[PDB]
A paper describes a structure:
Type IV-A CRISPR-Cas systems diverge from this general mechanism, using a nuclease-independent interference pathway to suppress gene expression for gene regulation and plasmid competition. Here, we present several cryo-EM structures of two evolutionary distant type IV-A1 and type IV-A3 complexes (from Pseudomonas oleovorans and Klebsiella pneumoniae, respectively) bound to cognate DNA targets with and without DinG. The structures reveal multisubunit DNA-surveillance complexes that intimately recognize their DNA-targets to form an R-loop structure. Our results support a model in which DNA-binding is achieved analogously to type I Cascade, while recruitment of DinG differs mechanistically, even in closely related subtypes.
Cryo-EM grid optimization and exhaustive data collection yielded a sufficient amount of particles to reconstruct three structures of the DinG-bound type IV-A3 effector complex, with DinG resolved at ~3 Å to ~7 Å in three distinct states (states I–III). But unlike type IV-A1 DinG, type IV-A3 DinG contacts the palm domains of Cas5, Cas7.1 and Cas7.2 through HD2 domain α-helices 22–25, and interacts with the thumb-domain α-helices 8 and 9 of Cas7.3. Moreover, arch domain α-helices 14 and 15 are near Cas7’s WL motif, and DinG inserts its C-terminal tail into a cleft formed between Cas8’s CTD and the palm of Cas5, thereby anchoring the HD2-domain poised for NTS recruitment. Collectively, these results suggest that the interface between DinG HD2 α-helices (α22, α23) and Cas7’s palm primarily determines DinG recruitment. We next compared the three type IV-A3 DinG states, based on a structural alignment of the complexes. This revealed that the Cas8 and Cas5 contacting C-terminus, and Cas7 palm binding segments of α-helices 21 and 22 of DinG, do not rearrange between the states. Thus, the C-terminus and α-helices 21 and 22 appear to anchor DinG to the complex. The arch domain becomes stabilized in state I, as corroborated by the absence and presence of cryo-EM density in states II and I, respectively. Additionally, the arch domain rearranges and becomes stabilized in state I, as evidenced by the less pronounced cryo-EM density in state III. Examination of the cryo-EM map also revealed low local resolutions (4–7 Å) for the vFeS domain and NTS exiting the HD2 in all states.
Author numbering: 1 to 263
The structure:
DNA sequence: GGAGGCCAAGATCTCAATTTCGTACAAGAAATCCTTTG
C-alpha cells in the first residue's frame, strides 16, 4: 500500500484499469518491486517476459507491462497490436503528486503524436523532451511530496526499485530507470531549492561572467583545470558568492549546472 | 501448434579537450707491497 509504486500507479497508471483483468492469488514476492506479498493482500498478476521468466507483478507494478493500444496508441507500427507500455517508454518522464494523487506526463513530441486523444482526458500531458524535464520542474510550482520519474526507460524492475518520494524541493529524487543504489543517488538527486536560489542570484552577473563561471566549474568538477586556476578565474570575475552557493560535491555541481543551462 | 531463437523497432540528447628524474662522492690496513738495497 504505502510504497512508491502504489502512488504512481494510482495517480498515473490507473488510466489503464480496464486493460489488465482480474489478479491471481500468489504466494511469492513481486519480482518487479520486490516487496513482500503481505502488502498485496495475497493477489498478484502472473506474467512471462520476453526472456521466458515467470514473474509476479502486483497491481501497481503490472501496469508497466499492459498493452492498451486503444488508450496508449501504437508504439511501433511493425507490431500494431501492442501499444505503448508504461514500462517501455524511453525519454518519457512524469511528476506525480501523491497527496493530490494526480500526475503530469512529460513526453516528447513524438510520443504525444503517438498518443490518442482519449489518453489526454485522463492524464494531462505537456510536450517536453528529455532535456526539457528540468525546465518544467524549475519553472512550474511543484507540489510535494511527489514522485518524479525522469526516464521510464525499459528496465521496469530498476525503475520501480528506484522510485523515491520527493518530500520537498531541497531533494527531488529522479527515477531514471537505473537502479537507485545508495552509491548513485547523487546522480539522481536534484536540489531544486539550491538551483532556484543560484538562478535567482545569477541575474546579477553578466552573460560572459555566467559562461565563464559555468565553464570553470565544469572543468573543475571534471579535473580539467587546477583548483588554483579556477580560484583565479572566480576571483578575477568576482564569482565568489556563486561558488559559496555551490555544493562541495562535484557531481551535484554538474547536475545543477546542467539544470541551469537548460533554464 | 506450441516453444525457443534472431532480428527490428522503439523519444530525442548528452559536453570536457591535456607539454619531457639524479651531477661527482671517497680512510686506516695484511698488505703482497716488496723490494728495494744488493
Ligand atoms: Zn510490484
Amino acid at each position: 500500500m504505502n510504497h512508491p509504486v502504489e502512488s504512481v500507479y494510482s495517480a498515473l497508471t490507473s488510466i489503464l484499469l480496464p486493460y489488465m483483468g482480474e489478479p491471481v492469488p500468489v504466494q511469492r514476492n513481486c519480482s518487479c518491486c520486490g516487496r513482500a506479498p503481505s502488502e498485496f493482500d495475497g493477489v498478484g498478476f502472473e506474467l512471462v517476459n520476453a526472456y521466458r521468466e515467470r514473474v509476479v507483478h502486483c497491481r501497481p507494478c503490472q501496469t508497466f507491462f499492459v498493452s492498451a493500444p486503444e488508450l496508449m496508441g501504437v508504439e511501433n507500427p511493425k507490431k500494431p497490436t501492442t501499444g505503448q507500455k508504461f514500462g517501455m517508454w524511453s525519454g518519457v518522464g512524469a511528476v506525480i503528486n501523491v497527496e493530490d494523487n494526480s500526475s503530469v506526463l512529460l513526453a516528447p513530441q513524438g510520443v504525444v503524436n503517438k498518443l490518442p486523444e482519449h489518453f489526454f482526458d485522463h492524464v494531462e500531458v505537456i510536450t517536453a523532451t528529455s532535456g526539457q524535464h528540468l525546465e518544467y520542474l524549475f519553472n512550474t510550482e511543484l507540489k510535494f511530496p511527489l514522485i518524479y520519474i525522469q526516464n521510464f526507460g525499459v528496465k521496469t524492475y530498476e525503475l520501480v526499485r528506484s522510485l523515491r518520494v520527493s518530500l520537498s524541493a531541497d531533494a527531488i529524487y529522479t527515477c531514471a530507470d537505473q537502479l537507485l543504489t545508495r552509491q548513485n543517488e547523487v546522480l539522481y538527486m536534484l536540489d531544486l531549492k539550491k538551483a532556484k536560489e543560484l538562478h535567482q542570484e545569477i541575474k546579477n552577473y553578466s552573460k560572459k561572467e555566467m559562461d565563464i563561471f559555468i565553464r570553470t566549474v565544469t572543468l573543475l568538477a571534471y579535473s580539467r583545470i587546477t583548483p588554483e586556476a579556477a580560484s583565479n578565474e572566480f576571483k578575477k570575475n568576482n564569482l565568489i558568492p556563486l561558488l559559496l552557493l555551490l555544493p562541495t560535491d562535484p557531481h551535484q555541481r554538474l547536475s545543477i549546472l546542467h539544470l541551469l543551462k537548460k533554464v
